[PDB]
Amino acid sequence: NLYFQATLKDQLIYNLLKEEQTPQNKITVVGVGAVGMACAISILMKDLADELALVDVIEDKLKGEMMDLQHGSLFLRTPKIVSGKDYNVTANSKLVIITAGAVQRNVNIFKFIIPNVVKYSPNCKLLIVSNPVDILTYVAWKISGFPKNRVIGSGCNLDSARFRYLMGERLGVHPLSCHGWVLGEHGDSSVPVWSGMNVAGVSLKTLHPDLGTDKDKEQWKEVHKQVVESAYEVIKLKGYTSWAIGLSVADLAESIMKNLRRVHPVSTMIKGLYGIKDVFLSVPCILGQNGISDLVKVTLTSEEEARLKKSADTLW
Amino acid sequence: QATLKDQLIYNLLKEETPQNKITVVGVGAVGMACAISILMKDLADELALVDVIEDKLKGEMMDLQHGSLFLRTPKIVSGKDYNVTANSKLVIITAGARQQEGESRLNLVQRNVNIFKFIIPNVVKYSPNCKLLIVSNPVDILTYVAWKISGFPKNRVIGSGCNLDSARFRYLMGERLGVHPLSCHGWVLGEHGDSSVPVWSGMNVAGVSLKTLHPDLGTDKDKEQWKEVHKQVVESAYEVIKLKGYTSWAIGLSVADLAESIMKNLRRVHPVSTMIKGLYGIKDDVFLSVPCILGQNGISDLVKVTLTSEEEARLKKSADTLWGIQKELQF
Amino acid sequence: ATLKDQLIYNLLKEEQTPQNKITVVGVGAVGMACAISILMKDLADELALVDVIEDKLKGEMMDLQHGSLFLRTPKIVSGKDYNVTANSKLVIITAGARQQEGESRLNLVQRNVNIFKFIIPNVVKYSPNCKLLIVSNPVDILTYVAWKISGFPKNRVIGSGCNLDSARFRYLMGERLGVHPLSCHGWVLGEHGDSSVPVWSGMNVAGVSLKTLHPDLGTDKDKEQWKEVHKQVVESAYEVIKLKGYTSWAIGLSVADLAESIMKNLRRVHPVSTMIKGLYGIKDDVFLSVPCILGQNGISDLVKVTLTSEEEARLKKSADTLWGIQKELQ
Amino acid sequence: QATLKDQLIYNLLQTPQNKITVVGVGAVGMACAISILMKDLADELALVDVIEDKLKGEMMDLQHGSLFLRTPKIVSGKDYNVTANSKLVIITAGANLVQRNVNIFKFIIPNVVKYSPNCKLLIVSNPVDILTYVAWKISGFPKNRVIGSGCNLDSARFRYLMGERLGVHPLSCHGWVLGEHGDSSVPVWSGMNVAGVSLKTLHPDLGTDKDKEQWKEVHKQVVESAYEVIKLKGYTSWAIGLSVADLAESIMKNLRRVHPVSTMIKGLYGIKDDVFLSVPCILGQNGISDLVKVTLTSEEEARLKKSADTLWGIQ
Numbered sequence A: 001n002l003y004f005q006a007t008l009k010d011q012l013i014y015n016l017l018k019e020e021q022t023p024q025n026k027i028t029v030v031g032v033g034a035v036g037m038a039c040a041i042s043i044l045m046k047d048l049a050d051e052l053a054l055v056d057v058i059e060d061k062l063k064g065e066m067m068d069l070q071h072g073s074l075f076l077r078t079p080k081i082v083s084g085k086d087y088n089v090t091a092n093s094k095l096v097i098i099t100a101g102a103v104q105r106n107v108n109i110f111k112f113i114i115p116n117v118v119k120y121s122p123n124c125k126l127l128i129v130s131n132p133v134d135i136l137t138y139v140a141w142k143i144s145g146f147p148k149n150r151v152i153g154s155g156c157n158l159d160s161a162r163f164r165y166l167m168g169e170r171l172g173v174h175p176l177s178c179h180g181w182v183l184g185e186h187g188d189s190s191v192p193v194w195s196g197m198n199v200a201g202v203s204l205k206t207l208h209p210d211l212g213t214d215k216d217k218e219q220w221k222e223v224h225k226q227v228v229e230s231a232y233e234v235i236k237l238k239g240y241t242s243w244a245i246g247l248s249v250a251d252l253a254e255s256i257m258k259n260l261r262r263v264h265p266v267s268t269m270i271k272g273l274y275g276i277k278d279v280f281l282s283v284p285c286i287l288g289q290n291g292i293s294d295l296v297k298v299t300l301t302s303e304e305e306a307r308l309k310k311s312a313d314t315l316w
Numbered sequence B: 001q002a003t004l005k006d007q008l009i010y011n012l013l014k015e016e017t018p019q020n021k022i023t024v025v026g027v028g029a030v031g032m033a034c035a036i037s038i039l040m041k042d043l044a045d046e047l048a049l050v051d052v053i054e055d056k057l058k059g060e061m062m063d064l065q066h067g068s069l070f071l072r073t074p075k076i077v078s079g080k081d082y083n084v085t086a087n088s089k090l091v092i093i094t095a096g097a098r099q100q101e102g103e104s105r106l107n108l109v110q111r112n113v114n115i116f117k118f119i120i121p122n123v124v125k126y127s128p129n130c131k132l133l134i135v136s137n138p139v140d141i142l143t144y145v146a147w148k149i150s151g152f153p154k155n156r157v158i159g160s161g162c163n164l165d166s167a168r169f170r171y172l173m174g175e176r177l178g179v180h181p182l183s184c185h186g187w188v189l190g191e192h193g194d195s196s197v198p199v200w201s202g203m204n205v206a207g208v209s210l211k212t213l214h215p216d217l218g219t220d221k222d223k224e225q226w227k228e229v230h231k232q233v234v235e236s237a238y239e240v241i242k243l244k245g246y247t248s249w250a251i252g253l254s255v256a257d258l259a260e261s262i263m264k265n266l267r268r269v270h271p272v273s274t275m276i277k278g279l280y281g282i283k284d285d286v287f288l289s290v291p292c293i294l295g296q297n298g299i300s301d302l303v304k305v306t307l308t309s310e311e312e313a314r315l316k317k318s319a320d321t322l323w324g325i326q327k328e329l330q331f
Numbered sequence C: 001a002t003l004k005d006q007l008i009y010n011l012l013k014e015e016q017t018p019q020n021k022i023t024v025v026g027v028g029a030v031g032m033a034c035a036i037s038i039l040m041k042d043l044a045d046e047l048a049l050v051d052v053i054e055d056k057l058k059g060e061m062m063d064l065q066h067g068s069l070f071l072r073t074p075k076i077v078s079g080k081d082y083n084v085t086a087n088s089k090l091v092i093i094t095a096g097a098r099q100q101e102g103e104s105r106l107n108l109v110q111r112n113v114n115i116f117k118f119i120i121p122n123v124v125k126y127s128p129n130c131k132l133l134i135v136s137n138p139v140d141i142l143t144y145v146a147w148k149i150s151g152f153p154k155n156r157v158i159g160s161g162c163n164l165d166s167a168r169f170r171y172l173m174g175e176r177l178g179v180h181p182l183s184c185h186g187w188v189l190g191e192h193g194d195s196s197v198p199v200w201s202g203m204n205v206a207g208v209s210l211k212t213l214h215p216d217l218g219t220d221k222d223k224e225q226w227k228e229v230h231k232q233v234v235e236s237a238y239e240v241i242k243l244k245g246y247t248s249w250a251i252g253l254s255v256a257d258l259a260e261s262i263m264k265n266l267r268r269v270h271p272v273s274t275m276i277k278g279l280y281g282i283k284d285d286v287f288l289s290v291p292c293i294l295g296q297n298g299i300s301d302l303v304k305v306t307l308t309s310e311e312e313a314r315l316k317k318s319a320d321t322l323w324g325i326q327k328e329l330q
Numbered sequence D: 001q002a003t004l005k006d007q008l009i010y011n012l013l014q015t016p017q018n019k020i021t022v023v024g025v026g027a028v029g030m031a032c033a034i035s036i037l038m039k040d041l042a043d044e045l046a047l048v049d050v051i052e053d054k055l056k057g058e059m060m061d062l063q064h065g066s067l068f069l070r071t072p073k074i075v076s077g078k079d080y081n082v083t084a085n086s087k088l089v090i091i092t093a094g095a096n097l098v099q100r101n102v103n104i105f106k107f108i109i110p111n112v113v114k115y116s117p118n119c120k121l122l123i124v125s126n127p128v129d130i131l132t133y134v135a136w137k138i139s140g141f142p143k144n145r146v147i148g149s150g151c152n153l154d155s156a157r158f159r160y161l162m163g164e165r166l167g168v169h170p171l172s173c174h175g176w177v178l179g180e181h182g183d184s185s186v187p188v189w190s191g192m193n194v195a196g197v198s199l200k201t202l203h204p205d206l207g208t209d210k211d212k213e214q215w216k217e218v219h220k221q222v223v224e225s226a227y228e229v230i231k232l233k234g235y236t237s238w239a240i241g242l243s244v245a246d247l248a249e250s251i252m253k254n255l256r257r258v259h260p261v262s263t264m265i266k267g268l269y270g271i272k273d274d275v276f277l278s279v280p281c282i283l284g285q286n287g288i289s290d291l292v293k294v295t296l297t298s299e300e301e302a303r304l305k306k307s308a309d310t311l312w313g314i315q
Ligand SMILES: Cn1ccnc1C(=O)c1ccc(NC(=O)C[C@@H](C(=O)O)c2ccc(C(F)(F)F)cc2)cc1
Pocket: B025, B026, B050, B051, B052, B080, B081, B082, B083, B084, B095, B115, B118, B119, B122
């Protein structure tokens, strides 16, 4: 180091600039558990970030994960993958995905996580994935001071995806052509909007008025029951759920990063709509570079809205 | 009573074979990494998962199915019975014993050779025309075992080999040179293990030989100590296993890279495990990585790399290290 | 020994039938738009181009081949002889006289019918198991034609139909509502032409009936004049021809969208041309667009859309228009 | 009117973060536009030209296929207020085409830099080597943000022909054509290889007159490629469209891949003038960040000085 050494790089490369240039489409993932890495690989293989930053308190695992993704750089189009306990690595993130945690036991963690994120990434959109996403989305919105539009919770984007996959299995149609929405709490009190289910615009409830009721001879209510028990079943089998939620988060990050303005059922403040006064639950929202820029005023039945009011009641 | 599906859909074809079916055997961290990477690259219209651990098998299958909306692979199945792998174009075998911290891949021979005695005959039974892509370790030896048990022609028995070692080597090249690995060209050949051989004479950027600009490239007298780049490649697996307990994402992307060239018949060059009896004066039925052309028929061609005395010797040494084990077994 | 032999050791002289081959018939602006879209979506391992123009055919092939470094389709063949189309899984037929400015797609019938009498039999000879994706106009009538000449079951003969008409309709929806066309759901059925039918009763966003919130949706007494959105869809092809002389990119993406569903057996729903005999009282062998489940066997199912008496009447009229032209053919 | 929208959408609330502009909507410009759209490189694409009809027709045709894309905003117009905040601007407008095209550049380059000051310039109009110098002088940008397509396609053609001869995908065939994007391009035979195996080492007569296999034809085909395609279909568009979109990917994503694009090579291979031509450069978000110093033989370096002297003459 004391002596001047002629480098192979100097013989080969002639330099013009010397600026990191600040990242343009950077994304950060807080938490490198199964869910965290699932979101990381899905984002990496969708070419959504020119720089990926991983952060978690377990530094031995954090480094191994980073090195594992870095070794596959040849097969990716994301030219920079960094990690580190210090949240300085997350500077200039356009989107921060939070999957860290094990409600109070996790709300404390948000106190130590959210400010660090907001410190180095003030203009970034928050995508809360940690459970209960309905409440922790309201938390990160209070601990951060960000405008509600830039505080998104994953919410029921996966519940609806599960709901449409089950629709397809019953109809022999790809879920892309099975339209249906699961709203409310991302949990046992989710609300299936039976009045919107359709294929090619044909309302199923109109064909089958018993749809979703107990008199339904086909028991389409079991479909929502499966959407609720899904995570319970996969967890009891493999110990956790990761692939499904990872693909869901990446599809949200796609709408946000690329500013597509697609409609997703993500958590957000619903003060006023449906008579609810108080805090955060999922509804169809347009998603773009500014996060939730709009809401869709879905016309719910009295029974549907009743459950939603019951879902918001359960939440706090 | 008419059902909702009949009120909605008028059927024409009451039928149901798949054209680009891929099977992943073993749903460990490696198998499931290959699965997700293949699913997200749209290489198959049907993905089959096979493993003995049924509880984890179904859970992984279900977890993948729930993301169907976000994928372009309309069918995902699983089961302990190999009949679910019928008519696969490509069978990726990842099941077996993986190395623990500090453990060498060659210490897995006895265990995985015994497992391959039960896997290969069943895969071959239901997919006699598929291409076998072996990932289980030690891959170089298990590729030879899979080729002996299967009875397939050597072109349809490929081992992932050094496709990842070379990817790691090119990544470390990119970090030193500040270039994307895609434009950093370097080959790690031989065993997918401690005896891998770096071909310094073939390293280049934009066709500029690096050993010509730096004649000490890869030697002990190298002031830049480029020999350490290959040391990291060899230690890579151990370093990551020591940090997170296993490897998954890098191998999964590498296997997906080979599957892409096989399924799409690209005829790209890859360093994959194949028999090299006759090349470089090697007279034993040994398998190891040389650059091969990969297509819908598997390994259709080998590229004969030009090696120096040191490089050719290190490759003959890597073969002797492997044959010393293949000849002690019973398969 | 040659340089190749000094460098490459061979193991397999045996070659295999192409596994995911697609053929595009016609190297016009429409055919080449389908070809470039299919290449950049990695739907095939072999692309074959066929046409009667020997010069333009070779030039288009070379122009694609020279960009092979940036594609994942390792074989691009072409030629006036249809033997280059052998073993195709999907044959996309775009050849034929195209719609000139002001002209109606229905004036091209007799010209392209004679052309299809030459194209279809040669295609069927070398790819008897393929799906036929008809794009030539009028696509609805020409789908019926290709089905009669080919002898295939009607599930393997598909017309691009109103897959583009519905895509154009959903783009205008998003423009008005400020939403991505993906999240704006609306269907245009019937003829791929002037007699198309907008299904207002199905229009929705996030499963919210728009006609329910706005009962006057699409009617003459409509405050927001939504019937114009459909009028734009009908006239879109005309306004595009007047500005650049033809339509290419949009149809190319729509056709590539259908090929994806077919080649990958996705079983998505698409509004494509097929026999609707048995729907809405129709008893004739008339072809037009309704939502169909597309897979590796082509059209496996049809969706029975619940239409209003006004929408259904429009569809009947559209069918009568095409049936009046179909029965007068040899 | 728009009363239904407020019945359905409850509002809560920007400039583009990944905008790209393609000046000129001819066969090349549209081939570049379509290639960029189907690679999801831009969140906004802007088409600009002078013929108001064709400009709108192309915009509409692309807009109709928006459902099949992920580019949520496609705009066009004659005024360059559409190209504002562009991170990359591809210049294809134009028609021995020096006098005609240099005139057009004097009119376009000023307007582009106005609304897009921090953008990178990707010059595709021919002669690309000279017009990259022209665009650089008129723009005032630092030479790292003025890129010419150059021999990126020439190398993409040189590769392929290699593939056909060897039975290998061009991805695994490596060869570099440098110099002027034209008849004076220089093929670096010393760098041709498959999997690091120098073809020149296995076959010393490679590319020379004594070549028994006549590999010099491969480069001849590359030089004649554009002529032969124009002679058959009347123009080239697809290959150059895919080539430009490849450069766009490295720039828009800051990949730092090596491409043989046209840039100033003052101080290399014996050149003190301000001449632009093709060498392997590393492309990223800031354009050409570095150059690769390819070791050229005595004959290779000779051709480059002549290909540079003539080019500089016009310049
Ligand atoms: C280590 N490992 C990882 C993954 N798999 C392994 C194994 O060792 C392994 C080794 C052998 C198997 N055999 C089968 O699956 C048998 C199966 C089939 O062949 O279909 C079958 C199904 C139904 C019947 C019937 F009709 F009689 F009921 C008979 C046979 C499975 C796993």
